Amino acid sequence: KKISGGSVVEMQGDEMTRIIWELIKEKLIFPYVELDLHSYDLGIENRDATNDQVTKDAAEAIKKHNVGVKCATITPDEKRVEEFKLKQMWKSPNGTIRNILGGTVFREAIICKNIPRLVSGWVKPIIIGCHARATDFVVPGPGKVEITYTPSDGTQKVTYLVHNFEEGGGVAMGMYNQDKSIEDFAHSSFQMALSKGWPLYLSTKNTILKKYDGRFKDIFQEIYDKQYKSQFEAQKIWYEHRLIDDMVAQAMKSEGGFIWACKNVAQGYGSLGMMTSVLVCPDGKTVEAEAAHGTVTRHYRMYQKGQETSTNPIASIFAWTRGLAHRAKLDNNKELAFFANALEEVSIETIEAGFMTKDLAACIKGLPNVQRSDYLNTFEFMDKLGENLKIKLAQAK
């Protein structure tokens, strides 16, 4: 029956995912597990009427229960504020959500065999973490651009000279990082490895800045030897520092299945609707899993019309299965764990079953070469994911 689910946060979405999000709850999640949900609407009007207050009210809950999940929501813009008669510009709910949570976002393609990739060789996805601003300016004429660090503890001020613009103008900037944040990035990176048991690779460009990587190279390595190395080395997982061209070579040469990292994003070898974006918290309890794509606006603007369209759920599903199978690690539950793990099967295997959406079929055959009988629509594809799931449960337990 419905099975005991912990307390698993939710966040309602906007547009074509707010659709897709629902059929996932009602077909693919509710029937089977019973999670006690705290479901905090991020639907734009509610964010608009209640003026940002619901976003926080959720972001503080996810930190409490330790598992959130999120539909893709519309960051208002000029048009977005104006379309719905919104009463304000609303910074991206994530920027609200994330910075309340903290943490580091790991985007992970979910890889299917029949889906073409960038590397033909990748069996497992590379998970790409990235850390995360800065101040810059012009210098319209000659002068000394010299960054000046004044200590607040009272001692000798220490400054350096970045450059001297003598002929005319130029451009110049600062950047910074707090070791505090950097250290949350290691833990988010390390336990995202341990969550997946994958090898972690920090990457840097050493030559270009030495002390700067020299913290990032060390401040992980200062954590690895210190802590996770035991849980890494035994458990077969392990960490390695690396350099861009070094790995991004082997990253092209490998099967995948490692936790990348970087410093300052979509790109990807899969479609936008394949990418799953998990915000892992630095404490390792709390996991906020949203599909990486947008609200699939082109698809919805045709759904108003009732026109039959194809919007790929799998990223939205695998929000849940990163949330469900996380709660099960916090709860040491295998009734919740095995459910997702089998849902991720049924979700992916459905595409090895030939049942795909238009965006995937438009990956394979190309843009024109797809015909409506080459794929399944936004509603049809979802329905199979129930069909194969229950048939899977039929033979599972």
Residues of this chain that bind ligand NDP (CB under 6 A): 72-75, 80, 94, 272-273, 290, 293-299, 311-312, 359
Pair 54, 104: CB distance under 8 Å: no
Q: Is 306 exposed, middle or buried (0-12, 13-18, 19+ CB in 10 A)?
A: exposed
The torsion angles phi and psi of 168, rounded to 5 degrees, stand at 50, -140
Interacting stretch for a copy of itself, rule CB under 8 A, among 50-58, 72-80, 247-255, 368-376? 247-255
**339-345: which pairs have CB atoms within 8 A and are 24 or more residues apart?**
339/3, 339/32, 339/33, 342/389, 342/392, 342/393, 342/396, 343/28, 343/317, 343/389, 344/110, 344/318, 345/392
94 interface partner picked from a copy of itself, ligand NDP, none, CB below 5 to 8 A per type? ligand NDP
Q: Which amino acid is at 181?
A: S
Find which of a copy of itself, ligand NDP, none residue 248 binds, CB within 5 to 8 Å per kind.
a copy of itself
Nearest to 104 by CA among 202, 228, 187: 187
74 contact, one of a copy of itself, ligand NDP, none, CB 5-8 Å limit per kind: ligand NDP
Of 79, 176, 226, 332, the one binding a copy of itself (CB under 8 A) is 176
Q: Cα(141)–Cα(134) distance, rounded to whole angstroms?
A: 22
The entry of ligand NDP, a copy of itself, none that residue 89 binds, CB within 5 to 8 Å by partner kind = none
By CB under 8 A, residue 133 contacts a copy of itself: yes
CB of 319 to a copy of itself, least distance (A): 21
Nearer to a copy of itself, 5 or 125 (CB): 125
Residues for the chain: how many in total?
Answer: 397
Measured torsion, CA atoms of residues 63, 69, 71, 75, in degrees rounded to the nearest 10: 20
**What is the pattern of x (binds a copy of itself, CB under 8 A) and - over residues 185-224?**
-----------------------xxxxx--xx--------
Among a copy of itself, ligand NDP, none, the one that 179 touches (CB under a kind-dependent 5 to 8 A) is a copy of itself
Q: What angle do CA 104, 216, 102 make, to 5 degrees?
A: 20
Binding site for a copy of itself (CB under 8 A): 118-119, 133-139, 141-153, 158-180, 182, 208-212, 215-216, 244-245, 248-249, 252, 264-267
